[PDB]
Design an enzyme around this catalytic site. Structure first.
Site, PDB file in Angstrom:
ATOM      1  N   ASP B 160       0.787  -1.228   0.000  1.00  0.00           N
ATOM      2  CA  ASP B 160       0.000   0.000   0.000  1.00  0.00           C
ATOM      3  C   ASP B 160       0.828   1.292   0.000  1.00  0.00           C
ATOM      4  OD1 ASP B 160      -2.543   1.251  -0.254  1.00  0.00           O
ATOM      5  OD2 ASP B 160      -2.891   1.253   1.865  1.00  0.00           O
ATOM      6  N   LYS B 162       1.864   4.782  -0.929  1.00  0.00           N
ATOM      7  CA  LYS B 162       1.277   6.025  -1.468  1.00  0.00           C
ATOM      8  C   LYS B 162       1.609   7.189  -0.524  1.00  0.00           C
ATOM      9  CE  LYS B 162      -3.186   4.782   0.729  1.00  0.00           C
ATOM     10  NZ  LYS B 162      -4.565   4.367   0.368  1.00  0.00           N
ATOM     11  N   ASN B 165       0.264   7.466   3.122  1.00  0.00           N
ATOM     12  CA  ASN B 165       0.784   6.561   4.179  1.00  0.00           C
ATOM     13  C   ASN B 165       2.192   6.850   4.648  1.00  0.00           C
ATOM     14  OD1 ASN B 165      -1.561   5.057   4.280  1.00  0.00           O
ATOM     15  ND2 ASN B 165      -0.794   3.383   2.946  1.00  0.00           N
ATOM     16  N   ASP B 178       0.545   2.410   8.336  1.00  0.00           N
ATOM     17  CA  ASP B 178      -0.425   1.543   7.749  1.00  0.00           C
ATOM     18  C   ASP B 178       0.119   0.260   7.112  1.00  0.00           C
ATOM     19  OD1 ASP B 178      -2.824   0.439   7.011  1.00  0.00           O
ATOM     20  OD2 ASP B 178      -3.708   2.304   6.393  1.00  0.00           O
ATOM     21  N   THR B 195      -4.311   0.490  -3.673  1.00  0.00           N
ATOM     22  CA  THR B 195      -4.963   1.748  -4.092  1.00  0.00           C
ATOM     23  C   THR B 195      -4.899   1.844  -5.621  1.00  0.00           C
ATOM     24  OG1 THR B 195      -4.380   2.783  -1.973  1.00  0.00           O
ATOM     25  CG2 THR B 195      -4.968   4.279  -3.667  1.00  0.00           C
TER      26      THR B 195
HETATM   27  C1  LIG Z   1      -1.261  11.255  12.246  1.00  0.00           C
HETATM   28  C2  LIG Z   1      -0.448  10.082  12.702  1.00  0.00           C
HETATM   29  C3  LIG Z   1       0.566  10.483  13.545  1.00  0.00           C
HETATM   30  N1  LIG Z   1       1.425   9.599  14.093  1.00  0.00           N
HETATM   31  C4  LIG Z   1       1.281   8.314  13.876  1.00  0.00           C
HETATM   32  C5  LIG Z   1       0.269   7.807  13.006  1.00  0.00           C
HETATM   33  C6  LIG Z   1       0.216   6.401  12.793  1.00  0.00           C
HETATM   34  C7  LIG Z   1      -0.712   5.852  11.954  1.00  0.00           C
HETATM   35  C8  LIG Z   1      -1.626   6.687  11.266  1.00  0.00           C
HETATM   36  C9  LIG Z   1      -1.639   8.051  11.467  1.00  0.00           C
HETATM   37  S1  LIG Z   1      -2.843   8.887  10.450  1.00  0.00           S
HETATM   38  O1  LIG Z   1      -2.086   9.952   9.780  1.00  0.00           O
HETATM   39  O2  LIG Z   1      -3.993   9.291  11.304  1.00  0.00           O
HETATM   40  N2  LIG Z   1      -3.250   7.805   9.186  1.00  0.00           N
HETATM   41  C10 LIG Z   1      -4.432   6.906   9.253  1.00  0.00           C
HETATM   42  C11 LIG Z   1      -5.686   7.557   8.683  1.00  0.00           C
HETATM   43  C12 LIG Z   1      -5.725   7.451   7.148  1.00  0.00           C
HETATM   44  N3  LIG Z   1      -4.627   8.241   6.453  1.00  0.00           N
HETATM   45  C13 LIG Z   1      -3.315   7.499   6.607  1.00  0.00           C
HETATM   46  C14 LIG Z   1      -2.593   8.061   7.838  1.00  0.00           C
HETATM   47  C15 LIG Z   1      -1.127   7.667   7.789  1.00  0.00           C
HETATM   48  C16 LIG Z   1      -0.654   8.684  12.360  1.00  0.00           C
END
Ligand SMILES: Cc1cncc2cccc(S(=O)(=O)N3CCCNC[C@@H]3C)c12
Ligand SMILES: Cc1cncc2cccc(S(=O)(=O)N3CCCNC[C@@H]3C)c12
Lengths: 20, 344
Positions: B160, B162, B165, B178, B195
């Site tokens: 995945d 992109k 992520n 992710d 995706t």
């Molecule tokens: C802000 C953030 C900040 N620190 C750690 C994180 C770990 C996983 C996901 C996130 S997250 O960004 O909330 N996340 C999931 C929601 C869908 N978009 C992908 C993205 C990477 C984190």
């Protein structure tokens, strides 16, 4: 231009995954 | 060319594999509880639930907590993928992968508590700026090359890649998050996932595929970073899929001839011509002319000054993320889907 075509398209936001 | 440098990499990966396997065979479970955390703000959402900034009450450290509703995971047939995600994430250890600090579950939800990465999604910065310069894109691409070298050595496929992520840390380096579709497999696998813009042709054509899909996706990522738009786009997924299988790519006029040459070799429709999947493996990519100025060891050790450092006004700052609507966390009095998530 190709970039102008992209920014007016339906997929410029966050893209979700697909699955079976 | 094999030399001393290549032998040092081999030795590092051998020791990393030993470490991984000990955790793979004996996974950590139930290492915290919900009421140890103060919930502050939602940082992101998905189909299974949400990610929230939380504060650990006993240490005062901030963390990002991913919450998955067990019933929604069952309804969408993602049980096995969710089990893969947690078992893999608790076992890995690399500078460009987000660290899983705690995991636990209750009657309703699954929880994964990760390090908080405050710089925001690469996605946000890319859409704002438009495109990254070649040197800027190469800095990020190098980190992903070393990450896939590590992951693939452990028999993992990521599936995945992109800009959504990839998060930017305080030093301007990448952290991959992710792992929802990551899988440990020797041999081919068959699930249709990922995706649309980033899917390799073998996935679309239902052919059975391997780690080479990750190297295709890296070709898509580099193009998008350097152009400001992906190589294959349309308003509807099926129109995207048509373009991917045709094997026709157009490069922007400003791409250097070396970038074009790398991308023709990563975006190769035929598996046995695709860089990353030939006899020299990852070394065909690391030795390509586009990467001639890259000091691979310095990138790993984080000694290169990043081209961009995001603005951070103190611990707990969320200004690099968008705002989302706040929902209460519901925990049922009866246990849901107990058998299905037994090993989590
Ligand atoms: C802000 C953030 C900040 N620190 C750690 C994180 C770990 C996983 C996901 C996130 S997250 O960004 O909330 N996340 C999931 C929601 C869908 N978009 C992908 C993205 C990477 C984190
Ligand atoms: C990883 C995995 C892990 N543990 C148990 C499993 C049981 C059935 C299927 C899988 S699975 O491989 O995730 N799976 C189902 C998803 C779609 N692809 C077909 C394949 C047989 C399991």
């Amino acid at each position: 231009t190709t970039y102008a075509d992209f920014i007016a398209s339906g997929r410029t936001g966050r893209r979700n995954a697909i699955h079976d | 060319k094999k030399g001393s440098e290549q032998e040092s990499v081999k030795e590092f990966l051998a020791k990393a594999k030993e470490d991984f396997l000990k955790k793979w065979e004996n996974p950590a479970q139930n290492t915290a509880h919900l009421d140890q955390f103060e919930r502050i703000k939602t940082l992101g959402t998905g189909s299974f639930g949400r990610v929230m900034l939380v504060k650990h009450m006993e240490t005062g450290n901030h963390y990002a907590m991913k919450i998955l509703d067990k019933q929604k995971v069952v309804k969408l047939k993602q049980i096995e993928h969710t089990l893969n995600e947690k078992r893999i994430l608790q076992a890995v250890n690399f500078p460009f992968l987000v660290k899983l600090e705690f995991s636990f579950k209750d009657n309703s939800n699954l929880y994964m508590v990760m390090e908080y990465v405050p710089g925001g999604e690469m996605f946000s910065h890319l859409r704002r700026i438009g495109r990254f310069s070649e040197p800027h894109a190469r800095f990020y691409a190098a980190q992903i090359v070393l990450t896939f070298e590590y992951l693939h050595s452990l028999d993992l496929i990521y599936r995945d890649l992109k800009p959504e992520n990839l998060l930017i840390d305080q030093q301007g380096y990448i952290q991959v998050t992710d792992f929802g579709f990551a899988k440990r497999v020797k041999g081919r696998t068959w699930t249709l996932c990922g995706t649309p813009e980033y899917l390799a042709p073998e996935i679309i054509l239902s052919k059975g595929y391997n780690k080479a899909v990750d190297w295709w996706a890296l070709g898509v990522l580099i193009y998008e970073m350097a152009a400001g738009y992906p190589p294959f786009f349309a308003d509807q997924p099926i129109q995207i899929y048509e373009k991917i299988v045709s094997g026709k790519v157009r490069f922007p006029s400003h791409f250097s001839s070396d970038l074009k040459d790398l991308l023709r070799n990563l975006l190769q429709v035929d598996l046995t011509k695709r860089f990353g999947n030939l006899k020299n493996g990852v070394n065909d990519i690391k030795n390509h002319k586009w990467f001639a100025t890259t000091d691979w060891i310095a990138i790993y050790q984080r000694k290169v000054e990043a081209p961009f450092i995001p603005k951070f006004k103190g611990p707990g700052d969320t200004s690099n993320f968008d705002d989302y609507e706040e929902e209460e966390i519901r925990v049922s009095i009866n246990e849901k889907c107990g058998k299905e998530f037994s090993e989590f």
